């Protein structure tokens, strides 16, 4: 109809285009920073995987309560999401994968208690229902271990008491700077898959264990759990 | 003026080309942030009152001060101030220089050295 | 289209269909600029139902057989009312919208759902 | 002698090489010249660690405790930031 | 509106108010399309002060008492200058926007802030 | 610029040059937004050849002799076709890009590169 309103609409769309370009460049810088940060952090995880393989091959006769395998009952989940939208709908993909997995679990007649660390999960996925012991949010970009310390610690403590048996984590898998996919993983029983490392090359002496024989392993196990959840969170941030 | 206008023209063009990045200032690196701050300073330097024409020498001194780093220290909102202050410190302590510049308009090494020394003296001693 | 002329059910079904279509029409800008994901679930349901309704309003004709070659169809009124009532009620949320194209009735839609 | 000595707490890597002698609390000072024998692991004390590479190069680093691993030709420290 | 006619404080106050309003005018499209959360703190302060100023310009009239039932008001120039200077200084940031509506002066705003 | 009028090889070379230029244009924003890295080798070859073509498109003029002193050039079509076909083949993949700037023909390019 009126030409002036059409011109105003054109100008508004031009301004929106400019601001969205600016946001694209900002996302580029942040993605590069997250990539370099996680690349820096990866060798520590590789070293700790090497050391856990080293110790499990050193003393395989003694197994902690996490090495347990009690019958499946009252499984758990870990959900990591974003604090804001405009993310191309990966959060909905993760939520739908988790909803189908938990539907299968309910078909197996097992109730679920899980921890949520993404703001979108607590703000939206909670609106329907679900028992949550840890609902941390607003962790921010590149948080610290102190920021996310007790959220999984209390859940692991509940696992130790026997109320929890299986603990799951789900996030987005970084495969290419343009493409990503959801992931499902199980971490609590620390089930071994590659145990042939260092068997063929020396290491027949192991360790004398002067301070403690097999007591110090619990601390490194909790450190390992923290490391895996932290790396999953940062991977999700980069994918976002 | 012909020698000195190109720098501010380039600064204004660079500020125009990127303006949406004002809110994400912490995100960009050092060079682009410096470009943003210089563009803001330059675009506030162009403000002027009414019935107050500027002579050739005043424009030359202001543009020379802006083209170097002497305008980086001052706060953005204080750019309108300190400009009249620098001009008023001149014309009373450097009257012959502006008389020569206004009458002739020539440009050489000596004029640049005198302008640099005057700006340095004003920045060192006076207040705005 | 008067509740005293056509009845109480007919008027309500027609009004609901028009309301759904009009609500879908107003969302043409957000989906154009932004993506599909930046909407509430209710808006997504409205969009899907409106697309299915748009497909379901098309049927083949006896006269237009020469142009295409498919035989013509004729639909009684009560079948149309039943089909639209079922569509708006909440069922037919699993049938793909490709099965609503030039089918005539609704049992034909159900039969065609297993082919395309 | 000493070839490598790595300590990683969270995301930070350190550089070493030809370490003359190392001082730490809760370990007896055996760290430094690598013994080349008796592999062992210890719970690291939160005391600061002094490193002396060679020719009196004294630089200081602080750690807040953790797990220390020592082995012939392989010395790795896994500490905690807090 | 000239420094040599109305003075110095009046001109600065008016210019600053107009600048704040114009700056707030340019943030309509971004909030309309994108979420208000994705903004700097300065912009949020600007929009809050702009809303307070925008609804501080409304006062009841004596001859318009029949329309609304509220008694009229007559604010002197000094009171409005003082109120706008105080609002633009940075205070009055905790008072809700609703105290700025058909109130008259500024002491009346403070009084009304107790109830709503 | 169609094969019937100007022959086949002229058309092929022209379209190949335009395609390379278009690829460079569509890769320039990718280079700017992310970096020269994270790219394979064919894209880098395309970038280098596009830069060589961009420099080669320039040449001196007769009417600029009285200003610069460099002589003007009147390069014929054959030499241009030969040079661009050779550049697209990959023969001149080692010549520095500076030798292609404002030089004229192709043997002139070879001589200028040898001088450097």
Taking CA–CA distances from B18, the nearest residue in chain A reads A22
CA–CA gap between residue D45 and residue D34 (Å, rounded): 19
CA–CA gap between residue A46 and residue D77 (Å, rounded): 14
User: Which residues are D42's β-sheet partners?
Assistant: D68
Helix axes B109-125, B95-103, angle to 10 degrees: 140
B20: domain range? 8-124
Asked if B4 contacts B63 with a C-beta cutoff of 8 angstroms, the reply is yes
Asked if A38 contacts A234 with a C-beta cutoff of 8 angstroms, the reply is yes
* Closest to A118 measured CA to CA, from A36, A236, A9: A236
What is the least distance, in Å, from the CA of E12 to any CA of chain B?
A: 13
What is the least distance, in Å, from the CA of A66 to any CA of chain D?
A: 20
Nearest CB among A19, A85, A86 relative to E30 is that of A19
**Residue of F29, F33, F40 to mutate, interface with A, max A Cβ within 10 Å:** F33
Q: Report CA-CA distances (Å) from A238 to A144, A152, D7.
A: 16, 21, 27
Nearest CB among A13, A16, A89 relative to C37 is that of A89
**In a domain? residue B1:** no
CA–CA gap between residue F86 and residue F100 (Å, rounded): 13
* Closest to A119 measured CA to CA, from A141, A101, A100, A102: A141
Asked if D53 contacts D17 with a C-beta cutoff of 8 angstroms, the reply is yes
B108-125 b/e with 16+ CB inside 10 Å = b?
A: eeebeeebeebbeebbee
Chains in contact with chain D (at least 3 beta-carbon pairs closer than 8 A): A
Chains in contact with chain C (at least 3 beta-carbon pairs closer than 8 A): A
- DSSP letter, residue E97: G
Asked if E1 contacts E11 with a C-beta cutoff of 8 angstroms, the reply is yes
**In a domain? residue B3:** no
Q: Chains A and C: how many Cβ contacts under 8 Å?
A: 9
Q: Residues in chain C whose beta carbon is closer than 8 A to a beta carbon of chain A?
A: 33, 35, 37-38
Does the distance separating the beta carbons of A84 and E37 come in below 8 Å? yes
Asked if B72 contacts B39 with a C-beta cutoff of 8 angstroms, the reply is no
- Chain D environment of A208 (Cβ under 8 Å): 38-40
* Closest to C96 measured CA to CA, from C46, C39, C56: C56
Phi and psi (nearest 5°) for D58? -105, 115
* Closest to D25 measured CA to CA, from D64, D82, D74, D73: D64
What is the least distance, in Å, from the CA of F10 to any CA of chain A?
A: 39
Q: Is A10 helix (H, G, I), strand (E, B) or coil?
A: helix
Per-domain residue ranges for chain F? 1-116
Asked if A105 contacts A112 with a C-beta cutoff of 8 angstroms, the reply is yes
A91 burial via Cβ count (<10 Å: 0-12, 13-18, 19+): buried
DSSP A101-169: HHHHHHHTT---EEEE-SHHHHHTGGGT--EES-------SS--TTTTSHHHHHHHHHHHTTS---BEE
Phi and psi (nearest 5°) for A170? -140, 140
**In a domain? residue B110:** yes
What CA dihedral angle connects D48, D52, D56 and D59, to 10 degrees? -40
- Pair of tokens at residue F33: 């937004």
CA–CA gap between residue F79 and residue F109 (Å, rounded): 12
- Chain A environment of D69 (Cβ under 8 Å): 51
Q: Residues in chain A whose beta carbon is closer than 8 A to a beta carbon of chain E?
A: 12, 15-16, 19, 84-86
- Chain C environment of A85 (Cβ under 8 Å): 38
- Pair of tokens at residue D56: 């009196």
What CA dihedral angle connects C10, C16, C22 and C27, to 10 degrees? -150
CA–CA gap between residue B43 and residue B37 (Å, rounded): 10
* Closest to F53 measured CA to CA, from F92, F26, F9, F79: F92
CATH number at residue B25: 1.20.150.20
* Closest to A164 measured CA to CA, from A134, A136, A139: A134
Does the distance separating the beta carbons of B28 and A22 come in below 8 Å? no
Q: Report CA-CA distances (Å) from B93 to B56, B99, D32, D39, F5.
A: 17, 12, 69, 80, 77
- Chain C environment of A13 (Cβ under 8 Å): 33
Task: Please state the domain count of chain B.
Answer: 1
Q: Do the two chains A and F touch, given a threshold of 8 Å on CB pairs and at least 3 pairs?
A: yes
Name, in order, each residue with C-beta under 8 angstroms of C56's C-beta and a sequence gap of 6 or more: C83, C84, C87, C100, C103, C109
- Chain A environment of C38 (Cβ under 8 Å): 85-86
**In a domain? residue B2:** no
| B24 interfaces chain A, CB cutoff of 8 Å | yes
What is the least distance, in Å, from the CA of A144 to any CA of chain D?
A: 10
Q: Residues in chain A whose beta carbon is closer than 8 A to a beta carbon of chain F?
A: 24-25, 28, 32, 177
Asked if A116 contacts A134 with a C-beta cutoff of 8 angstroms, the reply is yes
- DSSP letter, residue D25: T
- Chain B environment of A22 (Cβ under 8 Å): 20-21, 24
Report the run of H or E that residue A171 belongs to, with start and end: strand A168-174
- Pair of tokens at residue B39: 């563009």
Does the distance separating the beta carbons of A12 and E37 come in below 8 Å? no
* Closest to A20 measured CA to CA, from E34, F15, B67: E34
**Residue of E35, E40, E43 to mutate, interface with B, max B Cβ within 10 Å:** E40
- Chain A environment of D36 (Cβ under 8 Å): none
| A223 interfaces chain D, CB cutoff of 8 Å | yes
F101-112 b/e with 16+ CB inside 10 Å = b?
A: bebbbbebbeeb
Looking at B1-128, list the stretches that DSSP marks H as alpha helix, in order from N- to C-terminal side. 2-17, 30-45, 56-67, 83-89, 95-103, 109-125
């Amino acid at each position: 109809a009126n030409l002036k309103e059409i011109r105003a609409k054109v100008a508004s769309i031009k301004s929106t285009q400019k601001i969205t370009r600016a946001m694209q460049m900002v996302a580029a810088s942040k993605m590069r920073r997250a990539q370099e940060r996680m690349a820096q952090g990866r060798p520590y995880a590789d070293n700790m995987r090497r050391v856990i393989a080293h110790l499990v091959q050193a003393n395989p006769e003694y197994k902690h309560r996490y090495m347990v395998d009690r019958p499946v009952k009252r499984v758990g989940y870990i959900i990591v999401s974003s604090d804001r939208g405009l993310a191309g709908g990966l959060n909905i993909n993760l939520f739908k994968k988790v909803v189908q997995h938990v539907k299968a679990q309910q078909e197996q007649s097992i109730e679920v208690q899980f921890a949520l660390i993404g703001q979108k999960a607590v703000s939206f996925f909670k609106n329907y229902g679900g028992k949550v012991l840890g609902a941390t949010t607003q962790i921010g970009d590149a948080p610290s271990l102190e920021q996310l310390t007790g959220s999984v610690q209390v859940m692991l403590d509940a696992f130790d008491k026997g109320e929890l048996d299986r603990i799951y984590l789900v996030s987005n898998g970084f495969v290419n700077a343009m493409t990503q996919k959801p992931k499902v993983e199980q971490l609590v029983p620390l089930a071994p898959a590659e145990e042939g490392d260092d068997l063929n090359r020396t290491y027949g002496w192991d360790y004398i264990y002067e301070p403690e024989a097999e007591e110090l392993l619990n601390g490194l196990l909790v450190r390992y759990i923290e490391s895996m959840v932290y790396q999953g969170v940062i991977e999700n941030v980069a994918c976002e | 003026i012909k020698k000195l206008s190109g720098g501010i023209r380039t600064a204004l063009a660079q500020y125009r080309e990127l303006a949406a990045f004002a809110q994400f200032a912490s995100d960009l690196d050092e060079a682009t942030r410096k470009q943003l701050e210089h563009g803001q300073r330059v675009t506030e330097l162009m403000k002027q009152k009414q019935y107050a024409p500027y002579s050739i020498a005043d424009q030359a001194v202001s543009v020379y001060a802006s083209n170097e780093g002497y305008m980086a220290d001052v706060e953005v909102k204080k750019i309108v101030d300190f400009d009249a202050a620098l001009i008023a410190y001149f014309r009373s302590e450097y009257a012959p220089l502006m008389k020569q510049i206004d009458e002739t308009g020539d440009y050489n090494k000596d004029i640049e050295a005198a302008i640099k020394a005057g700006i340095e003296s004003f920045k060192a001693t006076q207040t705005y | 289209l008067d509740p005293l002329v056509v009845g109480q059910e007919h008027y309500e079904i027609a009004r609901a269909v028009q309301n759904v279509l009009q609500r879908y029409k107003e969302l043409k800008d957000i989906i154009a600029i932004l993506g599909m994901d930046e909407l509430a679930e209710e808006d997504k349901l409205v969009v899907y139902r409106a697309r299915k309704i748009q497909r379901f309003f098309s049927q083949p004709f006896h006269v237009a057989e020469v142009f295409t070659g498919a035989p013509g169809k004729l639909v009684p009124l009560k079948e149309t009312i039943r089909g639209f009532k079922g569509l708006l009620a909440g069922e037919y949320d699993h049938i793909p919208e490709q099965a609503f194209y030039m089918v005539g009735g609704i049992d034909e839609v159900i039969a065609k759902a297993e082919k395309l | 002698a000493t070839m490598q000595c790595d300590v990683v707490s969270v995301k930070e890597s350190i550089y070493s090489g030809a370490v003359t002698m190392l001082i730490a609390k809760g370990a007896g000072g055996e760290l430094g010249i690598l013994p080349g024998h008796a592999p062992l692991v210890t719970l690291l004390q939160p005391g600061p660690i002094r490193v002396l590479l060679e020719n009196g190069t004294e630089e200081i680093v602080y750690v807040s405790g953790g797990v220390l691993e020592v082995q012939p030709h392989v010395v790795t420290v896994l500490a905690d930031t807090a």
